[PDB]
């Protein structure tokens, strides 16, 4: 069998797989599933320029016909619903190929939205209208006494979901199916931890976001999300596409990928159109679980399934914080960094530069192929008698066989060190045909004692 260890990384790397399986009785649908299935009203706006370019007004006085909506006080949307209302078409601007500039409807534009508040409790929290029917672009907010949810949206909060969620309805998404409760839900996923669409919450999946008497909802499209409008309007590949830090220390500049204390509740899915990332988590004292797998989920801030990887993006590095983490890479070069704390980090493939940072860390290895001579892992502060380099999922347990050179039979390993230099390196000859097929270079010493096979 493996180690504690790799059975850890190779449990959470499943964790929230989905397709081909039930899950709380109900078909699990992956993101391209779940993508047909938020458009599966054909509604779209429609483009030629290969861009839908749209216009939107913040309603400054009752439309025609607007008394009879049995909507009651009709009111222009505050200074504060504007902003966030800007922030939330933005996030939806940055995942797909779909302009919103504020101004009148024009010839020239693909389409036209209006927002507006409206004080009738009798209209909902909240609605919007498909692009395909009459009221096209529209969405509209309660706001009376009773239901102030609407008022000051901000980051995090229902208000600014609202926002994000019912402009989501008028781009052509719809709720995720047709009292009704989780139950009657079509697929499994149909949670806002991977889609702000859907009207049930993350705990019918499992996921933990925050307690009782406390809100906490993703300000931004989710992975589901960016999945149904990246297959109506195309991905839009332009935006962060240089070199990008999310979570501490953002430079992704929105506010919902920016983490500044411990306390912080983030909830986002990643959109990013290139260049060399990271997601900083260095900030979180809980323990944490970091997938930079493309389209995987992390557990982020003493939180679960709160943080994803979009479809089709690659990010590259990742830095745990205080807490027991696990690092999962991907197969591009990697950067890890445990942080303090007891931290299980795995590379994959390609070579990566792995840290661990204060602490007993474990350097997991699953395939030959993860550290081999020509692209090799490098683990550069390696704390002998501390760490350990975990092979067991290789080994299955079998063991390794430490000599000084390579005698051709499987399984013989050599633990070598350079102290000109502080450089060490593990190397393996897995299938015993006598020479080193997997390798492992350390900035510090490694002895037998700290791998585990
Ligand atoms: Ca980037
Ligand atoms: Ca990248
Ligand atoms: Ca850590
Ligand atoms: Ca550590
Ligand atoms: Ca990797
Ligand atoms: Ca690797």
Do not use: C
């Given at each position: 069998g493996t180690s504690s260890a790799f059975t850890q990384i190779?449990?959470?790397?499943?964790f929230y797989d989905r397709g081909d399986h039930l899950v709380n009785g109900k078909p699990s649908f992956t993101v391209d599933q779940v993508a047909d299935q938020l458009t599966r009203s054909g509604a779209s706006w429609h483009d030629n320029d290969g861009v839908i370019n749209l216009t939107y007004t913040f309603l400054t006085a009752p439309p025609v016909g607007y008394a009879s909506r049995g909507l009651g006080t009709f009111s222009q949307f505050s200074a504060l619903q504007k902003e966030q209302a800007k922030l939330s078409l933005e996030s939806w601007a940055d995942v797909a190929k779909v302009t919103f500039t504020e101004g009148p409807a024009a010839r020239g534009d693909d389409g036209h939205m209006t927002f507006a508040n409206f004080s009738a409790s009798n209209g909902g929290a909240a609605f919007a209208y498909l692009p395909?029917?009459?009221?096209?672009?529209?969405?509209?907010?309660?706001?009376?006494?009773?239901?102030?949810?609407?008022?000051?949206?901000?980051?995090?909060?229902?208000?600014?979901?609202?926002?994000?969620?019912?402009?989501?309805?008028?781009?052509?998404?719809?709720?995720?199916?047709?009292?009704?409760?989780?139950?009657?839900?079509?697929?499994?996923?149909?949670?806002?931890?991977?889609?702000?669409?859907?009207?049930?919450?993350?705990?019918?999946?499992?996921?933990v976001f925050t307690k009782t008497g406390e809100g906490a909802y993703a300000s931004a499209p989710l992975l589901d999300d960016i999945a149904a409008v990246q297959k109506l309007y195309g991905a839009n590949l332009e935006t962060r596409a240089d070199d990008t830090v999310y979570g501490f220390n953002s430079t992704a500049d929105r506010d919902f990928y920016s983490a500044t204390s411990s306390t912080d509740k983030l909830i986002f899915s990643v959109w990013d159109g290139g260049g060399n990332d990271t997601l900083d988590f260095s900030g979180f004292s809980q323990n944490q679980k970091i997938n930079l797998t493309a389209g995987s989920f992390s557990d982020?801030?003493?939180?679960?399934?709160?943080?994803?990887?979009?479809?089709?993006v690659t990010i590259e590095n990742a830095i745990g914080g205080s807490g027991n983490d696990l690092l999962i890479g991907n197969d591009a070069a990697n950067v890890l960094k445990g942080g303090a704390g007891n931290d299980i980090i795995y590379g994959g493939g390609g070579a990566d530069v792995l840290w661990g940072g204060t602490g007993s860390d474990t350097f997991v290895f699953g395939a030959v192929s993860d550290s081999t001579p020509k692209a090799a892992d490098i683990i550069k502060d390696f704390q002998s008698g501390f760490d350990k380099?975990?092979?067991?999922?290789?080994?299955?347990?079998?063991?390794?066989?430490?000599?000084?050179?390579?005698?051709?039979?499987?399984?013989?390993?050599?633990?070598?060190?350079?102290?000109?230099?502080?450089?060490?390196?593990?190397?393996?000859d897995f299938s015993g045909q006598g020479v080193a097929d997997f390798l492992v270079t350390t900035v510090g010493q490694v002895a037998t004692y700290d791998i585990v096979a």
């Open positions: 190779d449990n959470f790397s499943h395909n029917s009459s009221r096209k672009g529209e969405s509209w907010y309660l706001i009376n006494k009773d239901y102030q949810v609407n008022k000051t949206p901000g980051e995090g909060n229902y208000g600014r979901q609202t926002l994000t969620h019912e402009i989501g309805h008028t781009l052509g998404l719809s709720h995720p199916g047709d009292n009704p409760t989780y139950r009657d839900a079509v697929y499994a996923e149909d949670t806002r931890a991977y889609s702000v669409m859907s009207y049930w919450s993350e705990k019918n999946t499992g996921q982020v801030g003493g939180m679960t399934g709160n943080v994803s990887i979009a479809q089709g380099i975990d092979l067991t999922a290789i080994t299955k347990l079998g063991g390794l066989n430490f000599v000084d050179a390579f005698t051709g039979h499987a399984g013989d390993a050599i633990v070598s060190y350079h102290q000109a230099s502080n450089a060490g390196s593990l190397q393996v």
